[PDB]
């Protein structure tokens, strides 16, 4: 409706995307603490997190509550099709489901679009690992 | 301003170029490959829109009402024909630079009316 | 009509019928079949007749034939060739090619019918294979596996797979931008001569950046310039139009700017009109162009002749190469400029380098068609050389000594043998088929490769692009340097094989399309443009009714083959039709008026498919399913399920055109064996897709006749207790790769910490995960000179110089061991002397390749291609799982064994069940492989109910609560926990251990392959230690 | 903000709405109907044109939002044009009392005592918008 006024130093697109990412990241953290409150003292995830032996509070949160927003190059899922992310969506859909908010937990299991967008975000992490495993001794070798 | 187009020579259809009639003190458009000269009606030689302000409704094509993949709504009726369903979309463009305005097109065949809200 | 309770019956029936008809390797087979059916005949028909000169001799090839694969024995007798003999004897499985040649002399003629010109290697189970159409009985008579898919070649006895090669699509205009360039925008067209002889020739059309400071520059701004092939520097675009013979500015601009009432476009072209003002005639423009060649002509007319050849033959060959095509080239060049302008005006978004609608995949067919032209030209070239030396003697000429049949035969063989896709004078094609396990074989036959070079370094090729949906598996890619570059087909992905556009063009010419040459140039403004295979072909003034008519014809499978994609870009006013090969596509259900066209009657007919004649073809022919490619998908609305078609309180979309068949078909082969993959962190699905390829199983049923260099077969594979519906089509039931194991997730004695595993030794004593390893040795007699040869014989110390402390008395008099002999390291398996040019013979006998004690399993003896005696020896050794051995679970949880406890020491339930494997819980929480936990639960329900559990992803009918409720009915704790007792002391354990049956995999990696007994970064650390005497002792 | 606007590079393109170039040989009856009211101030009180002035007019419209946010003003632009070119260019501009933020530019008065003027004026327009540092 053009009722949104831009923040100084940000474009209206940056203003919009900032506001949407705040809402959805707050929801991820609000649901995640609600999950951590649910866990009994017997809970074996909590036993391993609180010991610090393995896992963290976000792993609990993603298993139990919400996997959350999927990102590529730090942004929400790109319109790789013309004005849409997949043929299943209509054009100009900026909503959370369209742009890769996985509102399900790993226990509930992902919907098909969420599964693909979670594969897109997971590919970036696989590429970055391949890059940094190419540099393991690079600066050490040059400095020595 | 708008934009300034082209004139072509009647004799040879090459582009006419502006030059002054220095003795009558009037702008002429004149061919560079033949004697043809034409008196200008416009005085303006050139305009350039750094802000790119133009009515994008001139660039929306009415045939786009046929696209299965755009969202459509009865929530915004057409003025010219009253038809309830309109298709709506963003600029689908660069050079909007910021805005997220929705453009509407009437879905009634052969109406093709376009507006912005 | 089909109701949502019947839907999960219906859609898996139609999927079953697709795989019954197509199978998994159909894009391999159909591509090679098209190569022999069509491309070979065209290559011979398109090759120029020989004009030879005395009398003049004109020679031409008429019609062509192949036999079934046929070997020619060492004496030259033909005999029919079976693939298994080719594997055993190291032969190439190939068919002789014969051609009808007419010899004409000037005038008289004689016909040389069925002249043999060479052998084409045959793709197994293609229509030209001897296995084609055979039944399971016949295949077993031939010692073939009925389940082996074919789709590979046998070259010198080695199975070879052509990995598909991704490339940018030809003939379409792309506009890209580049960061540093002289040019703000560059349009380009990688145009290619309609699959004719000569390669692709790129033209670029570029707009220069305004950043050049200078009065002349600033006064005009951004010039547009063409970059023509075979021309050293850019030509002002208006000169290229003048050289094509359009002289006035208005004639040129009517080809570039379709509405002259668009004054913002008019101002963009003025800097290029002024740049060309001084050239006003075609002859001056042709001189201007021809002056810029690699060797500018000595004279004006020689430059014009060179320029006119370049403009007709070299730029835009897909638009035409004939004497009058220059109006067509002007329209296409003006379109290429017009799209550059629209990109510069921001009116159209730039093209995407990674959008898979802009790609093509080159399969075996296109790869061999390209390659075969190189050999066939060499065939004619060698005839041209040889024949003229007889015609220069006036005597009559005989072709039957000029045709060197080794050209085709050895050129195709060599490139398929090596992967080097050209002369021994593109690489990594034609890989050896991986035979580790059946899923490995299926995934290798469906693998795709990316371009790492020119386009790849400009693209973002490793990212999972949005357009891989339903075409390429999102999970399946290698670790390491190849991440995201090597890819795999989705299970219902099909690659177009291509057809001639002639039937489509003749339809368009009658359905009131207006042709290239006929239009009044203004009329192109309101009309839509029709492109076929990238050729702009005409305009149409009612595109919606045209597009309806086109879709109807394709659905009826009338004039338009179902493989033809047809795309309307409604905002651009372009219709594009592609009959091109190498387009990836997938089948989708048609939706009309929010209803499927698939009705209950189609499912009923498909249910009787074993005795009613109805099949998947009838589903395509009825217009109920449709193939759609990656940029027709730009125009569909896809329902994910018929749930999306139901009425809803807030309506998202009311205009669905298509529906997904089942969303799980986005996965490929190795990802389809993962249970509950929608419950796993996506990196762990990727790791299983690589680990599945390393799981032992039964790789093929006829493994007893195969003499593979290395093979692993499991004693007791089981099908998974928990399975995906797609696993049916992978035939994973029939060739399983793993065992269902009782797994406790427990911290026991600590030997399973990190990723280690504890295994029950008593289960291992009972043959749990036991396997055998087969190693095959080849050896060959040779004849190296007039008095030196290698022969199989038993060496002896009284004659042979090369003798060692190795043991020869296991050999028989033929110099070979027999099967059933127990062998060890430095045992000689094949005694082979060479006579030398006290002693008289050198020893070249072959030893057991490792000290691992095995047993000789088979010894086959034959003759090679050269008729020398040829031996293969297969040795077997049994591999009982050890503490070093690696295991995995289908959820990326790889791990070595850590220790083995007997049943007495394992923890046990009240019922006396000890686990087979104990994994550490610390493997779970940060990896979030929750699918692994759900599998154990569903497997416990399955083993009690006696019913194999459906773990297909995206199934709203299977939820963890429902599995728990079912488990409770069998008297187990609803979450799979159980009271275990410590084996050492018998006390209850305070925690209740999660136990369930889980499908485990034994991986190829075993410690007996690896136990063995200091670079720059190691010296650097020893300097930081200051261990200076160590650092010099170690060097 | 005042210091921010003194550091962040701002060329005239940042603050220009549009260019129009005209043939206007008599400013006393200027071809743009908007300008006859306000331009006459510079002709009741003459400046520069004591010998002659070029008949080719370059008219720029400045963006009042982009001008006001930077707190730029027409005198500060026109004197930077005068500084950046010299007396071989002339600049004429509105008071912000007038409703529209026009600046009018012409080629030298006294050069009348290899690009034709409207070609040179298009070169000048590009050179200002490229490289007139405001
Ligand atoms: Zn003229
Ligand atoms: Zn209307």
SS (H, E, C) C651-687: CCCCCCCEECCCHHHHCCCHHHHCCCHHHECHHHHHH
CATH no. for residue C350? 3.90.1110.10
Is residue C980 within 8 Å of C954, Cβ to Cβ? no
Residue B4 distance to chain D (closest CA, Å): 10
C210 touching D (Cβ < 8 Å): yes
DSSP for C855-904?
Answer: EEEEEEEEE-TTS-EEEEEEEEEEE---TT-EEE-SSS--EEEEEEE-TT
Q: Which chains touch D (3 or more CB pairs under 8 A)?
A: B, C
- Give the Cα separation of D52 and D44 in Å (integer): 16
Measure the CA–CA gap between C441 and C248, rounded to whole angstroms.
63
CA–CA dist C338, C521 (Å, integer) = 14
Partners of C672 in the β-ladder: none
Phi, psi of D62 (to 5 degrees): -90, 150
Return the C-alpha torsion angle A135, A139, A140, A142, nearest 10: 120
Q: Given C266, C345, C637, which is nearest B69 (Cβ)?
A: C637
Q: Count of CB contacts below 8 A, A vs B?
A: 33
Instruction: Tell me if C500 sits within 8 A of C521, measured CB to CB.
Output: no
| Residue of B68, B90, B92, B100 for testing the chain A interface, max A β-carbons within 10 Å | B100
D64 touches chain C (CB under 8 A): no
Give the helix ranges, DSSP H, for C357-492. Answer: 364-391, 406-418, 438-444, 454-458
**Whole-number Å distance between alpha carbons of C484 and C163:** 15
**End-to-end alpha-carbon separation of chain A, Å?**
61
Identify the closest residue of chain A to C348 by CA–CA distance.
A82
B34 and B80 housed in the same domain: no
Buried b (16+ CB within 10 A) or exposed e, A9-37: eeebeebbbeebeeebeebbbebbeebbe
What resolution in angstrom units was achieved for this structure?
2.5
Q: What distance in Å separates the CA atoms of residue C967 and residue C952, rounded to the nearest whole number? A: 19
Beta bridge partners of C759: C900, C917
Inter-helix orientation angle C263-274/C326-344, to 10°: 120
Ligand 1 centroid–CA B38 distance in Å is 11
Between chains, do A119 and C475 touch, taking CB under 8 Å as contact? yes
Provide the greatest CA pair distance for chain A: 61
- Give the number of other Cβ atoms within 10 Å of residue C168's Cβ: 17
Q: Name C566's bridge partners.
A: C577
Structural contact between residues B4 and B46, judged by C-beta atoms closer than 8 angstroms: yes
CB contact under 8 A, B100 and A83: no
Probe site for chain C from A106, A108, A129 (most C CB atoms < 10 A): A106
Ligand 1 centroid to residue C694 C-alpha, Å: 77
For residues C849 and C777, is the Cβ–Cβ distance under 8 A? yes
Q: What angle do helix axes C249-256 and C263-274 make, rounded to 10 degrees?
A: 130
C708 in Cβ contact with C776 (< 8 Å):
yes
| Maximum Cα–Cα distance across chain D | 47
Residue in B with minimal Cα distance to A2: B101
The tokens of C648 are what? Answer: 């809803």
> Which run of H or of E encompasses C176?
strand C173-176
Q: Which long-range contacts (CB under 8 A, 24 or more apart) does C286-289 make?
A: C286/C243, C286/C311, C288/C235, C288/C239, C288/C243, C289/C228, C289/C231, C289/C235, C289/C239, C289/C240, C289/C243
Q: What sign results for the dihedral spanned by CA atoms C234, C237, C239, C243?
A: positive
Which residues in chain A have their CB less than 8 angstroms from residue B90's CB?
A: 83, 92
Question: What DSSP letter does each residue of chain D carry, written as one string?
Answer: -HHHHHHS--BGGGTEEEEEEEE-S-GGG-SSTTTHHHHTHHHHTT-STTS---SEEEEEEEPHHHHHHTT--HHHHHHHHHHHH-TTEEEEE--TTSSS-EEEEEE-SGGG----HHHHHHHHHHHHHHH-B-
Q: How far is the CA of B105 from the centre of ligand 2 (A)?
A: 7
Buried-state track C543-560, b at ≥16 Cβ within 10 A, e below 16? beebbeebbebbbeeeeb
Ligand nearest to the CA of B29: 1
Binding residues of B for Zn(2+), as ranges, are 9, 12, 31, 34, 78, 81, 106, 111
- SS3 state at C557: coil
Q: Across the strands, what pairs with C680?
A: C929
Composition of chain C by helix, strand, coil, percent to 5: 30, 25, 45
Chain A contact for C685 (CB, 8 A cutoff):
yes
Chain C: nearest CA to A69, how far in angstroms?
14
Report how far residue C918's alpha carbon sits from residue C940's, in angstroms, rounded to the nearest whole number. 16
Residue whose C-alpha is closest to residue D85's, from D52, D111, D112, D47:
D111
Helix (H, G, I), strand (E, B) or coil at C369: helix
Instruction: Indicate the helix (H) or strand (E) that contains C996.
Output: strand C993-1002
Question: What letter does residue C702 receive in the DSSP assignment?
Answer: T
C350, closest residue in chain B (CA to CA): B94
CATH of the domain at B64: 2.20.25.10
Pick the residue from chain C with its C-alpha nearest to B68. Answer: C655
Using an 8 Å CB-CB cutoff, list chain C residues near B8: 248-250
Shortest Cα–Cα distance, C187 to chain D (Å): 25
Q: Is C218 on the interface with D (CB under 8 A)?
A: yes
Cα–Cα distance for residue pair C802/C470, rounded to 1 Å: 62
Helix C600-607 crosses helix C7-21 at what angle (to 10 degrees)? Answer: 50
Chain C partners of D123 at a C-beta cutoff of 8 Å? 215, 218-219
CA separation for the pair D59, C585 (Å, rounded): 57
Q: Could you give the maximum distance between any two Cα atoms of chain B, in Å?
A: 64
Strand residues in B1-117 grouped as ranges (E): 17-21, 26-30, 37-39, 44-49, 72-73, 86-89, 103-106, 114-116
Q: Note whether B19 and B64 are same-domain residues.
A: no
At what angle are helices A12-38 and A57-64 packed, to 10 degrees? 90
Q: Which two tokens stand for residue B84?
A: 């309830």
Sequence-separated contacts (24+) of B37-44 with Cβ below 8 Å: B38/B7, B40/D23, B42/B4, B43/D22, B43/D23, B43/D24, B43/D31, B44/B1, B44/B4, B44/D20, B44/D21, B44/D22, B44/D31
**Residue C776 CA to chain centroid, in angstroms?**
29
- The pairing of strands C949-950 and C722-723 is parallel
Query: Are residues B65 and B35 both part of a single domain?
Result: no
Q: What is the DSSP secondary structure assignment for residue C779, as one 8-state letter? A: E
User: Who's near C464: CB < 8 A, 6+ residues apart?
Assistant: A119, A120, A123, C474, C484
User: Taking Cα atoms as reference points, which of A144, B68, A33, D82 lies closest to residue C634?
Assistant: B68
Ligand number nearest CA of B79 is 2
Instruction: Kindly identify which residue of chain A lies nearest to residue C664, measuring between CA atoms.
Output: A112
SS3 C72: strand
Helix (H, G, I), strand (E, B), or coil: what is residue C272? helix
Of C864, C785, C800, which is closest to residue C831 (Cα–Cα)?
A: C800
Of C481, C636, C681, the CB nearest to A130: C481
Ligand 2 center from residue B84 Cα (angstroms): 8
Number of H helices, E strands in chain B: 0, 8
Q: What is the span of the domain harbouring residue C245?
A: 172-360
Containing C274, the helix (H) or strand (E) segment is helix C263-274
Distance CA C487, CA C476 (A): 7
Q: What is the dihedral of CA B91, B95, B100, B102, to 10 degrees?
A: -30
Q: Is the dihedral of CA C370, C372, C374, C376 positive or negative?
A: negative
Alpha-carbon distance C134 to C144, whole Å?
A: 10
Spell out the residues 6+ positions from residue D104 whose beta carbon is closer than 8 angstroms to its own: D35, D39, D57, D58, D59, D60, D91, D92, D93
The total of other beta-carbon atoms located within 10 Å of residue C888's CB is: 23
3-state secondary structure string, C790-856? EEECCCCCCCECCCCCCECCCCCCCCECCCCCEECCCEEEECEEEECCCCCEEECCEECCCCCCEEE
The alpha helices in C57-146, defined as continuous H runs, are: 83-89, 136-141
Q: CA C990 to CA C590: how far, in whole Å?
A: 58
Looking at the complex, does the CB of residue B115 fall below 8 Å from at least one CB of chain A? Answer: no
Convert C664-678 to b/e letters by CB count within 10 Å (16 or more is b): bbbbbbbbbbbbbbb
- Which chains have at least 3 CB atom pairs separated by less than 8 Å from chain C? A, B, D
**Residue appearing with tokens 């004149």:** B30
CA of B37 to the centre of ligand 1 (A): 8
Residue B74: how many CB atoms within 10 A of its CB?
10
CA dihedral sign, ordered C394, C395, C400, C401: negative
Give the span between the Cα atoms of A70 and A110, in whole angstroms. 12
CB contact under 8 A, D126 and C210: yes
Q: Who's near C833: CB < 8 A, 6+ residues apart? A: C790, C791, C793, C795, C800, C841, C842, C843, C844, C845
> Look-up: residue for tokens 């043939």?
D23
Task: Specify whether C755 is catalytic.
Answer: yes
Mind telling me how many Å the CA of B73 is from chain A's nearest CA? 13
Q: Which residues contact B58 (CB under 8 A, 6 or more apart)?
A: none
Partners of residue A71 on adjacent β-strands: A76
Is D58:D124 a contact under the CB 8 Å cutoff?
A: yes
For residue B30, how far is its CA from the centre of ligand 1 (angstroms)?
Answer: 8
Residues of B whose CB is below 8 A from D116: 19
- Count of beta carbons in the 10 Å neighbourhood of residue D99: 10
b/e burial code for range C785-802 (CB count within 10 A of at least 16 → b): eeeeebbbbbbeeeebee
Residues of A in contact with C479 (CB under 8 A): 126, 130
**CA–CA dist C537, B30 (Å, integer):** 38
Element (H, E) at C1022: helix C1016-1025
Chain B residue with minimum CA distance to C542:
B63
Q: Which of B18, B47, B53 sits opposite D19 (nearest CB)?
A: B47
> Which residue of B18, B20, B50 is in closest CB contact with D13?
B50
Q: Which residue among B92, B98, B100 sits closest to A83, beta carbon to beta carbon?
A: B92
SS3 A49: helix
Q: Which entry of C351, C354, C580, C755 is annotated as an active-site residue?
A: C755
DSSP string, A123-136: HHHHHHHHHHTTST
Fold type of domain D2-134: Gyrase A; domain 2 (3.30.1360)
Structure tokens at C910: 């009240």
How close, in Å, is residue A18 to chain C by CA atoms? Answer: 23
Distance C159 CA to ligand 2 centre (A): 65
Return the closest-CA partner of residue C663 out of C930, C952, C957, C355: C952
Total domains in chain B come to: 2
Residues of B in contact with D125 (CB under 8 A): 48
* Cβ-proximal residues to C574 (8 Å cutoff; 6+ apart), any chain: C528, C529, C531, C568
Q: Give the C-alpha distances (Å, rounded to integers) separating C198 from C201, C315, C412, C481, C532.
A: 9, 12, 20, 35, 20
Closest residue in B to D16 (Cα) is B50
DSSP single-letter state for residue C208 = E
Question: What method was applied to determine this entry?
Answer: cryo-EM
Q: Are B98 and A12 in contact (CB under 8 A)?
A: yes
Q: CB neighbours of A139 closer than 8 A, spacing ≥ 6?
A: none
CB contact under 8 A, A137 and C463: no
Residues making up the binding site of B: 9, 12, 31, 34, 78, 81, 106, 111
- Shortest Cα distance from B25 to chain D (angstroms)? 7
In contact, C979 and C823? CB cutoff 8 Å: no
In chain D, where are the structural domains located?
Answer: 2-134
Say yes or no: B99 and B71 in one domain. Answer: yes
Show which subunits contact B, needing at least 3 CB pairs below 8 angstroms: A, C, D
Which residues pair with residue C108 across a beta bridge?
Answer: C105
Mapping DSSP to helix (H, G, I), strand (E, B) and coil, where does residue C269 land?
helix
Ligand 2 center from residue B102 Cα (angstroms): 16
Helix (H) or strand (E) holding C249: helix C249-256
Q: Residue C498: left if φ>0, alpha if ψ -120 to 50, beta else—which one?
A: left
Ligand nearest to the CA of B111: 2
Which residues sit opposite D59 in a β-bridge?
D20, D104
| Tokens describing residue C94 | 């190939």
Q: Are residues B41 and B62 in the same domain?
A: no
For chain C, give the longest Cα–Cα distance: 109
Of the candidates B4, B12, B64, the beta carbon closest to that of C263 is on: B4
Residue B61 structural domain: 49-117
């Amino acid at each position: 409706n053009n009722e949104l006024e831009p923040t100084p130093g940000n474009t209206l697109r940056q203003t919009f995307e900032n506001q949407v990412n705040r809402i959805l990241n707050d929801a991820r953290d609000k649901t995640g603490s609600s999950a951590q409150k649910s866990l009994s003292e017997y809970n074996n995830f909590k036993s391993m997190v609180v010991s610090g032996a393995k896992g963290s509070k976000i792993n609990i949160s993603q298993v139990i509550a919400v996997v959350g927003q999927q990102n590529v190059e730090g942004k929400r899922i790109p319109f790789g099709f013309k004005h849409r992310t997949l043929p299943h969506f209509i054009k100009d859909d900026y909503g959370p489901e369209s742009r890769g908010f996985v509102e399900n937990s790993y226990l509930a299991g992902l919907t098909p679009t969420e599964f693909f967008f979670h594969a897109m975000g997971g590919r970036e992490g696989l590429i970055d690992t391949a890059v940094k495993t190419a540099e393991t001794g690079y600066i050490q070798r040059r400095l020595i | 301003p708008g934009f300034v187009g082209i004139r072509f020579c009647q004799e040879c259809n090459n582009m006419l170029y502006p030059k002054e009639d220095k003795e009558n003190r009037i702008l002429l458009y004149a061919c560079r490959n033949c004697d043809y000269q034409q008196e200008a009606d416009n005085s303006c030689i050139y305009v350039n829109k750094i802000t790119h302000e133009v009515d994008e409704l001139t660039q929306i094509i009415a045939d786009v009402s046929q696209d299965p993949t755009l969202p459509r709504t009865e929530d915004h009726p057409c003025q010219k024909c009253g038809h309830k369903e309109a298709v709506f979309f963003q600029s689908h463009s660069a050079r909007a630079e910021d805005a997220m305005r929705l453009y509407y097109v009437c879905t009634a065949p052969h109406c093709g009316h376009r507006w912005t809200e | 009509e089909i109701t949502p309770d019947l839907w999960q019956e219906a859609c898996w029936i139609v999927i079953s019928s697709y795989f019954d008809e197509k199978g998994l390797v159909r894009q391999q087979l159909d591509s090679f079949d098209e190569f022999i059916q069509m491309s070979v005949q065209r290559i011979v028909e398109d090759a120029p007749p020989i004009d030879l000169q005395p009398p003049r001799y004109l020679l031409k090839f008429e019609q062509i034939y192949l036999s079934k694969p046929t070997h020619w024995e060492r004496d030259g007798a033909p005999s029919p060739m079976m693939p298994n003999e080719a594997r055993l004897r190291n032969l190439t499985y190939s068919a002789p090619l014969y051609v009808d040649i007419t010899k004409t002399v000037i005038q008289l003629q004689t016909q040389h019918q069925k002249t043999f010109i060479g052998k084409i290697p045959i793709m197994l189970r293609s229509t030209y294979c001897l296995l084609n159409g055979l039944t399971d009985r016949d295949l077993c008579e031939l010692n073939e596996c009925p389940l082996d898919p074919g789709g590979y070649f046998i070259i010198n006895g080695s199975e070879k797979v052509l990995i598909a090669q991704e490339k940018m699509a030809t003939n379409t205009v792309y506009v890209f931008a580049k960061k540093d360039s002289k040019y703000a925008y560059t349009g380009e067209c990688r145009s290619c001569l309609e699959n004719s002889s000569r390669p692709t020739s790129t033209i670029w059309v570029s707009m220069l950046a305004r950043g050049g400071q200078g009065a002349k520059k600033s006064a005009i701004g951004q010039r547009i310039v063409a970059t023509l092939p075979y021309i050293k520097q850019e030509v002002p675009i208006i000169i290229v139009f003048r050289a094509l013979g359009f002289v006035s500015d208005r004639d040129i601009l009517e080809h570039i700017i379709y509405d002259f009432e668009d004054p913002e476009m008019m101002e963009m072209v003025k800097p290029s009109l002024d740049e060309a003002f001084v050239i006003q005639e075609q002859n001056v423009a042709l001189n201007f162009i021809g002056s810029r060649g690699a060797k500018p002509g000595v004279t004006k007319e020689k430059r014009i002749k060179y320029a006119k050849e370049v403009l007709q033959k070299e730029m835009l060959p897909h638009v035409g190469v004939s004497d009058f095509c220059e109006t067509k080239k002007a329209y296409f060049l003006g379109y290429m400029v017009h799209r550059l302008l629209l990109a510069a005006l921001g009116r159209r978004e730039l093209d995407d380098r990674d959008h898979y609608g802009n790609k093509r995949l080159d399969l075996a067919g296109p790869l061999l068609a390209f390659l075969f032209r190189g050999m066939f030209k060499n065939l004619l070239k060698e005839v041209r050389i040889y024949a003229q030396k007889f015609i220069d003697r006036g005597k009559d000429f005989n072709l039957e000594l000029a045709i060197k049949t080794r050209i085709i035969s050895d050129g195709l063989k060599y490139s398929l043998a090596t992967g080097n896709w050209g002369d021994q004078k593109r690489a990594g094609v034609s890989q050896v088929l991986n035979r580790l396990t059946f899923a490995s074989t299926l995934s290798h036959l469906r693998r795709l490769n990316s371009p790492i070079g020119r386009d790849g370094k400009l693209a973002k090729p490793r990212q999972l692009h949005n357009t891989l949906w339903g075409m390429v598996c999102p999970a399946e890619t290698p670790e390491g340097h190849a991440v995201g570059l090597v890819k795999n087909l989705a299970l219902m992905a099909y690659i177009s094989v291509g057809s001639q556009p002639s039937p489509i063009l003749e339809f368009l010419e009658e359905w009131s399309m207006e042709n290239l040459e006929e239009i009044s140039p203004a009329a192109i403004a309101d009309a839509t443009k029709i492109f076929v295979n990238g050729c702009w072909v005409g305009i149409h003034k009612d595109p919606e009714q045209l597009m309806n008519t086109l879709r109807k014809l394709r659905r009826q499978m009338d004039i338009i083959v179902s493989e033809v994609s047809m795309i309307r870009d409604i905002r651009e006013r372009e219709i594009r039709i592609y009959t091109d090969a190498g387009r990836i596509c997938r089948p989708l259900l048609i939706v009309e008026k929010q209803k499927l066209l698939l009705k209950k009657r189609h499912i009923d007919q498909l249910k009787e498919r074993e005795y009613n004649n109805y099949s998947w073809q009838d589903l395509v022919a009825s217009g109920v399913v449709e193939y759609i490619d990656t940029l027709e998908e730009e125009t569909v609305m896809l329902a994910m399920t018929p749930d999306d078609l139901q009425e809803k309180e807030v309506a998202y979309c009311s205009t669905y055109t298509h529906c997904e068949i089942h969303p799980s078909m986005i996965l490929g082969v190795c990802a389809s064996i993962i249970p509950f993959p929608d419950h796993n962190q996506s990196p762990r699905n990727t790791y299983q897709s690589a680990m599945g390829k390393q799981a032992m199983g039964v790789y093929i049923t006829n493994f007893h006749v195969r003499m593979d260099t290395l093979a692993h077969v499991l004693y007791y594979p089981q099908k998974p207790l928990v399975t995906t519906r797609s696993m049916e089509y992978l035939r994973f039931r029939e060739l399983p790769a793993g065992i269902n194991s009782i797994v406790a997730i427990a911290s026991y004695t600590g030997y399973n910490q990190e990723d280690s595993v504890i295994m029950n030794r008593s289960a291992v004593d009972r043959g749990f995960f036991r396997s055998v390893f087969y190693r095959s040795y080849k050896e060959q007699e040779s004849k190296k000179g007039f008095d030196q040869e290698e022969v199989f014989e038993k060496p002896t110390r009284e004659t042979c110089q090369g003798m060692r402390h190795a043991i020869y008395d296991k050999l028989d008099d033929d110099g070979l061991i027999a099967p059933g002999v127990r062998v060890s390291g430095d045992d000689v398996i094949i005694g082979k002397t060479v006579t030398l040019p006290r002693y008289t013979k050198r020893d070249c006998s072959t030893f057991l390749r490792t000290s691992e004690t095995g047993i000789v399993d088979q010894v086959m003896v034959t003759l090679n291609q050269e008729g020398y005696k040829f031996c293969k020896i297969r040795v077997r050794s049994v591999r009982i799982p050890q503490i070093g051995d690696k295991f995995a679970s289908r959820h990326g949880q790889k791990g070595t064994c850590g220790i083995q406890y007997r049943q007495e020491d394992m923890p046990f339930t009240c019922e006396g069940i000890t686990p087979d494997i104990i994994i550490n819980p610390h493997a779970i929480p940060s990896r979030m492989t929750i699918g692994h936990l759900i599998e154990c639960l569903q497997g416990k329900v399955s083993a009690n109910k006696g019913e194999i559990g459906d773990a297909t992803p995206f199934n709203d009918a299977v939820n963890v609560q429902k599995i728990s409720n079912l488990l409770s009915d069998y008297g187990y704790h609803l979450r799979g926990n159980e009271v275990l007792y410590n084996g050492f002391t018998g006390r209850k354990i305070t925690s209740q251990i999660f136990i369930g049956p889980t499908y485990y995999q034994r991986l190829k990696h075993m410690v007996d392959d690896k136990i063995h007994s200091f670079g720059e970064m190691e010296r650097d650390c020893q300097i930081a230690h200051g261990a200076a005497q160590f650092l010099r002792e170690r060097l | 903000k005042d210091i921010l606007c003194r550091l962040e590079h701002t060329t005239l393109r940042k603050v220009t709405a549009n260019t129009a170039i005209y043939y206007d040989p008599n400013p006393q009856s200027t071809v743009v109907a908007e300008d006859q009211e306000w331009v006459n101030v510079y002709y009741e009180m003459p400046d520069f044109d004591v010998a002659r002035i070029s008949p080719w007019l370059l008219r720029v419209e400045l963006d009042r939002k982009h001008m006001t946010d930077r707190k730029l003003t027409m005198e500060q632009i026109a004197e930077k044009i005068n500084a950046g070119f010299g007396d071989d260019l002339n600049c004429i501009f509105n008071d912000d009392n007038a409703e529209k933020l026009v600046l009018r530019i012409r080629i030298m008065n006294s050069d009348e005592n290899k690009m034709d003027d409207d070609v040179f004026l298009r070169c000048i327009e590009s050179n200002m918008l490229t490289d007139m540092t405001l």
